[PDB]
């Protein structure tokens, strides 16, 4: 068995552009960072408050072959992405969320 961690991805608009605010299971603002100490999953739930019809399309990595995250799964409605982390390779990876929107055909990225 592993652990399952749950982060809410709140997206609001400020000065006409998206702002990503992560909340934890306590309702506290956080950075959306996770320390993994055994095999398990991380679940990100989208709360789109932008009116721009945001949907997750995946999770993007500049170093996708580093072995920190094993896999990404996505719900059919784009409201959830989950990461499988078997925590065999030690180290750190960074990623950005990738989203579609209904205002235009550009994909949306979290800044970090």
């Amino acid at each position: 068995q592993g652990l399952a961690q749950f982060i809410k991805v709140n997206v609001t608009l400020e000065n006409g552009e998206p702002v990503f605010i992560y909340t934890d299971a306590n309702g506290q603002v956080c950075q959306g960072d996770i320390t993994v100490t055994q095999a398990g999953t991380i679940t990100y739930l989208l709360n789109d408050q932008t009116l721009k019809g945001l949907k997750f399309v995946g999770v993007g990595f500049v170093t996708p072959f580093d072995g920190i995250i094993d896999a990404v799964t996505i719900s059919s409605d784009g409201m959830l992405v989950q990461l499988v982390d078997l925590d065999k390779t030690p180290g750190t990876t960074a990623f950005q969320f990738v989203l579609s929107n209904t205002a235009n055909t550009l994909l949306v990225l979290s800044p970090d």
Partner: peptide
């Protein structure tokens, strides 16, 4: 965000 793995 960042994931840190401690195995």
């Amino acid at each position: 965000p960042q994931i840190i793995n401690r195995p």
